[PDB]
């Protein structure tokens with residue numbers, strides 16, 4: 001593996017390893033003045049297109065592109081299916097720029113064939129808070145793959161981010177690239193055991209018959225934290241303090257403003273669910289997860305896998321095991337087939353006791369133009385969508 005594009009970028013080489021005492025950009029003293037003002041060149045017959053994610057039809061174009069062409073599991077049985085409403089929520093956070101929502105259309109058909117996006121946030125890395133772009137939803141149409149279009153998207157968004165005097169980015173991928181700061185396996189907790197078997201997500205054996213697997217995964221419809229309820233506006237100050245205080249321990253975390261806590265946590269049906277425990281006017285516990293269905297490719301019975309992805313979970317009145325058991329319950333009450341989590345923060349500590357299964361791969365975390373020590377994923381305290 002040669003990394004002919006990645007080698008030219010301010011990111012570590014495959015073999016670089018830095019001490020905890022290094023925590024700085026690869027390239028500093030950057031000047032907005034010097035950034036190229038011209039758009040990167042596309043191949044003949046393709047054009048940059050500014051996507052207006054707040055316009056239903058533009059948002060729908062992105063939706064269709066990703067639905068057809070976005071990330072599949074290692075075996076090509078599932079494809080991520082972010083909803084249009086999810087996209088809206090994901091891309092219009094506080095201080096977002098419409099111009100970091102970058103499509104490429106094929107001129108002859110006026111069809112969107114490429115996409116990349118970023119939103120700005122404060123990122124704390126080894127106790128240094130830096131303004132960064134959070135990049136996501138890079139996608140080239142399946143019929144246009146391995147044509148070196150992705151580097152053009154990446155260079156173009158880097159240029160536009162740099163124009164705002166931002167010089168660092170954070171991103172995740174399942175692929176290995178120069179060079180992860182941390183690497184987090186994913187795990188799955190079955191809710192609807194029978195569906196998961198029928199679609200090949202999960203497995204049975206002579207010792208685990210269907211009826212026993214169903215019994216293994218059954219959950220009691222009663223919360224450990226009795227008063228856990230959907231978050232409301234009035235809980236924003238309390239979540240900001242609970243979640244903020246919690247995150248300061250990790251090597252890698254977003255430093256949320258109150259405005260960002262409202263945007264990121266206030267519940268939206270089929271998008272984001274946040275539950276809180278309020279005691280004496282204080283928010284003492286919180287659970288949150290987001291909805292990311294997967295399209296099931298060619299299963300005769302089921303087209304969609306409804307899945308909850310653990311976002312941020314904090315307890316002060318219960319055990320973390322108890323809190324995450326409540327999170328599984330709340331996901332079941334909301335019709336999800338499965339609860340997914342990565343081995344970040346304290347999550348790994350509860351996976352065995354709560355009957356999570358190890359998945360088949362891992363999610364790599366990346367920083368652009370930042371040089372530091374890598375670390376085990378328990379020290380990661382940010383979950384990207």
Ligand SMILES: CCCCCCCCCCCCCC(=O)CSCCNC(=O)CCNC(=O)[C@H](O)C(C)(C)COP(=O)(O)OP(=O)(O)OC[C@H]1O[C@@H](n2cnc3c(N)ncnc32)[C@H](O)[C@@H]1OP(=O)(O)O
Nearest residue numbers: 003004005006136137138139140145146147148149150167
């Ligand atoms: C200061 C601001 C900085 C901002 C920018 C920050 C950086 C953000 C960077 C992006 C973060 C996005 C995070 C995110 O969205 C979440 S990760 C999931 C990304 N999307 C998908 O996997 C969807 C399915 N695949 C596709 O649409 C295509 O396969 C893509 C578009 C992935 C590559 O299209 P292609 O037709 O398969 O390939 P070529 O055009 O020929 O290009 C090949 C080159 O691209 C490198 N490549 C492959 N996958 C990559 C990936 N996931 N990140 C970065 N680079 C990736 C690859 O190593 C090679 O470079 P090399 O030759 O050096 O190896």
Ligand SMILES: COc1cccc(CC(=N)NC(=O)c2ccccc2OC2CCNCC2)c1
Nearest residue numbers: 071072073078079080186294340341342384385
């Ligand atoms: C079940 O259907 C699919 C479809 C496509 C790919 C995969 C495997 C996967 N790569 N999972 C995660 O990345 C993952 C697992 C647990 C928690 C978070 C995960 O990734 C999130 C979604 C994509 N971007 C980063 C967060 C499964």
Ligand SMILES: [Cl-]
Nearest residue numbers: 221222223226
């Ligand atoms: Cl209850």
Ligand SMILES: [Mg+2]
Nearest residue numbers: 146147148149
């Ligand atoms: Mg390409």
